Amino acid sequence: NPLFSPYKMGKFNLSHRVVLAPMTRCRALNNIPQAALGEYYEQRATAGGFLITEGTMISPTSAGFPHVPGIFTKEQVREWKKIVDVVHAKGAVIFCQLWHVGRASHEVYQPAGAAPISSTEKPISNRWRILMPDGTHGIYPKPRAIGTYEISQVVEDYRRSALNAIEAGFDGIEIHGAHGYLIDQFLKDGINDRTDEYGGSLANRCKFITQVVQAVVSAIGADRVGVRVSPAIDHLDAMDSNPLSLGLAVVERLNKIQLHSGSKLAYLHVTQPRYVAYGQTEALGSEEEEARLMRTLRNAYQGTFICSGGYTRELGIEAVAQGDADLVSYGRLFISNPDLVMRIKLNAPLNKYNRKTFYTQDPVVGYTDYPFL
């Protein structure tokens, strides 16, 4: 079984290749990680396994979901340490994803009702709604375009959060630059319309993520830095006119950073869209084109590649066997299977997941109440 072969991610000896994909679960009450998260990650922790935490706030103005954990305060560092130690007791490697939602925020999630920040003043259209603390869905407000100085401050927020993650005991961090969030709002030409060095061309649109990656590498080392992007996903009105060229531009920039710094990044993480036969009301793409895009980016990048999005046991085995990726991270499957690692090894049946309990703030039901084999 290819998925259970030893792999060397730098200085880490992984026993298998299944990874817990970063998934927001909204269980960190008052933006503070709780004891529920520790048991949540321990259940999915295995000897030599690789885990990625949910999107974690880097600043008070980076939340777009209710009760998401932060790592930008001293108190949150202490709570994360008890979770990391619990995971490390199982002999697993865990990274913390740094997440800034950008314009995908709301007044209820911003301090003193401040306007969300983004690359431009264009908001998210009415096609998308934002989940509210009371369970309803609200309208995305108009963001405020940030200047050159404020951009350097957001990069500083990434640097400090990475330092806090290492202080919390994490083995590394993952930069969330996908799914139409703050970094992805600078990369996609459908959102980026600035007339300065951060927009107007393919090279300029990638300047924000380069400074984010360079600062965190300069703080904790490239070997403890991961990057996640998704040029083919138009979540929250983040379509690109040429996902192929945008992906290659990002991949080329990462290679330049590695050569300049003389070090290899931890990995590259890319999610892909997956399409099925939809009706007219449901509302979509070419699967072969998406598969080719993943192969092209993997070939261009120099280092470990991680694929995600719609992958299963059979799909993951083929990806590793054909060399399309080094690691596979699973999402919704890990929600319903705390022991998904051993279930894949034994080809055991997989428990179904409940979408109504992906979010919400119950420590037990839909979060850790699912049973093992």
Ligand X SMILES: Cc1cc2nc3c(=O)[nH]c(=O)nc-3n(C[C@H](O)[C@H](O)[C@H](O)COP(=O)(O)O)c2cc1C
The residues binding its own copies (CB under 8 A) are 23-24, 125-129, 131, 136-138, 178-179, 230, 233-236, 239, 241, 243, 271-274, 276-289, 308-310, 331-332, 355-356, 358-359
- At residue 247, what are phi and psi to the nearest 5 degrees? -65, -45
Other C-beta atoms within 10 Å of 238: how many? 24
CB 264, min distance to ligand X, A: 21
Tokens standing for residue 181: 């969030």
Q: Which of 109, 181, 198, 267 is catalytic?
A: 181
90/116 Cα distance (integer angstroms): 39
CB 26, min distance to its own copies, A: 11
| CB closer to ligand X, 179 vs 343 | 179
186 and 81 Cβ atoms separated by less than 8 Å: no
CB 165, min distance to ligand X, A: 15
- Angstrom CA distances, 271 to 116, 167, 268, 347, stand at 25, 29, 10, 25
Identified binder of ligand X from the candidate list 172, 273, 309, 338, rule CB under 6 A: 309
- Coil, strand or helix: which one is 98? strand
User: Is 49 annotated for ligand binding?
Assistant: no
Identified binder of ligand X from the candidate list 160, 163, 358, 361, rule CB under 6 A: 358
Interface with ligand X in residues 163-192 (CB under 6 A): 176, 178-179
CB 366, min distance to ligand X, A: 11
| CB closer to its own copies, 186 vs 334 | 334
Q: Look up 181 and say whether it is catalytic.
A: yes
144 and 118 Cβ atoms separated by less than 8 Å: yes
Distant-in-sequence, close-in-space partners of 109: CB < 8 Å, separation ≥ 6 = 63, 64, 65, 66
User: Is 24 annotated for ligand binding?
Assistant: yes
186/176 Cα distance (integer angstroms): 13
116/119 Cα distance (integer angstroms): 10
Interface with ligand X in residues 197-256 (CB under 6 A): 228
- Coil, strand or helix: which one is 93? strand
Which residues are documented as binding site for FMN?
22-24, 55, 97, 228, 310, 331-332
Residues known to be catalytic: 181
Binding residues vs ligand X (CB under 6 A): 21-24, 54-55, 97, 99, 176, 178-179, 228, 271, 279-281, 308-311, 330-333, 358
Which residues are documented as binding site for substrate?
176-179, 274
Which residues are documented as binding site?
22-24, 55, 97, 176-179, 228, 274, 310, 331-332
